[PDB]
Design a protein around this ligand. Sequence first.
Ligand code: UV1
Ligand code: UV1
Lengths: 264, 265
Amino acid sequence: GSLTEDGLSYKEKFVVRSYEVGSNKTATVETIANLLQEVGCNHAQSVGFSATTTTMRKLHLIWVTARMHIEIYKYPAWGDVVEIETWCQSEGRIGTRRDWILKDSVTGEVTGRATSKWVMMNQDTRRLQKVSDDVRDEYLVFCPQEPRLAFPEENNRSLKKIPKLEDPAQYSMIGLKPRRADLDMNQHVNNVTYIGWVLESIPQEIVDTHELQVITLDYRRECQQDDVVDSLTTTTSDSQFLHLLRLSGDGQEINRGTTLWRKK
Amino acid sequence: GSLTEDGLSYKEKFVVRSYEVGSNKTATVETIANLLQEVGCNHAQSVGFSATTTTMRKLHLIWVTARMHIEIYKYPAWGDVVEIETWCQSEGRIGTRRDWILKDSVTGEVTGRATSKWVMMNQDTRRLQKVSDDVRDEYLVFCPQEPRLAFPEENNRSLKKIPKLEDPAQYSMIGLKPRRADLDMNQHVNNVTYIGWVLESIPQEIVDTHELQVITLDYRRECQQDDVVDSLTTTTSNDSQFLHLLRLSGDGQEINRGTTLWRKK
Ligand SMILES: COc1cccc2c1CCCC(=O)N2
Ligand SMILES: COc1cccc2c1CCCC(=O)N2
């Protein structure tokens, strides 16, 4: 992959692998989510971030996901080349935004798009801080100056408020525990695991007859390596669902989201 | 990737991804195992296979893993290029063998090697069978005629007999269930999941202070999407060695057995 001519976005092509595909012989949403992370990470390295700034490191500050929104029109088939373009944008003192565009490498058609909101947190106290002037200056030089949104439409699904699922849930998957392959290089549970965990409570008949079109996820708390999770789902309707990930014991909310599925 | 000049092996280069690495910033054994599968699968496609032959599809026969043996000297770092060469060999009427060699793309040094034994089985009844001559003929044309082994040594750990772990186990990880990402395109639990499940019962302090050098795995039964598994480990030993056992949570039916070898960092 490489940064574009202007140095304000990054592009990378991926060939879909045999183990990356589902029952339909196309990449899973978890494979797509892993690819968004890989292209975002390679963009971070290409601009010297490797995604902390020097001032964030001298202050024990880290970027954490608050919201992730993915919309897939066409899942690439096993063997196809998917091209992904990604870029970051400052949102004042609120935080950063990272956007992605997925294209079919042969036709050039847009096959998917994602948006993510990131916030500043102290790595130690976990207290969230508003972005200071110094951090914005270190970041803005690698961002487009004019707004560039993967989801520009007036009143779009990427900015919708998500409600809390009320008990009893229609469907559930209980006792989910993260294994070592669910941890990143810093021993934290990876964001992709939560997507898989949310989808575990969707009935197999829905999965077999429908394709996932949209997924919006709100991150409230991190799941530890020793925590046990319950995944809950209720139909709110195309088929639409409301989801909730909470700790098995105390019931502390860790995630909430919505999914939209189209008939095949 | 592509087949070699002679058409008797396949080569492919892979760049190690950010999400593919562990705490050491190097590819995990599960990432390596996924890469062996990807290169083996791309070799099957390059020579006209599904890897079933015309006669195997006509008889509802499939290839299933019986043993997998991996030995890693150096794990590639996040960003490095690993080159893998793979090939198949017939073992008479017993089954097929698939071998792999992993090299550092910059130095050309061998950083790992794997060997796997495969057996013929009816997809419906799950009954094993010795390979027929018609099937052996369709396969042999894509295999080296002279023997070509990733593990040639006169006494090698890839062919050692593995005993059954006796209760009580020293360490255990209880209630492991496969999720949808553990299933392949045919809704069967992936062989990489079993590797991860075996390693779940190894203590975190062993993992933190040691690197995995060898892993031999014997496949006895398939784990279904609705089955629950217990992973058991006992130390059998500078180097640390373990004996492992995966069994169904309920009845205790053995699904896997293996050994691991770990050296100090
Ligand atoms: C959803 O994207 C993710 C998730 C986790 C980690 C990263 C990324 C890409 C952008 C930031 C980064 O450097 N790494
Ligand atoms: C360990 O290698 C694996 C595991 C599972 C599936 C496959 C392979 C490669 C050789 C056969 C194949 O085409 N697919």
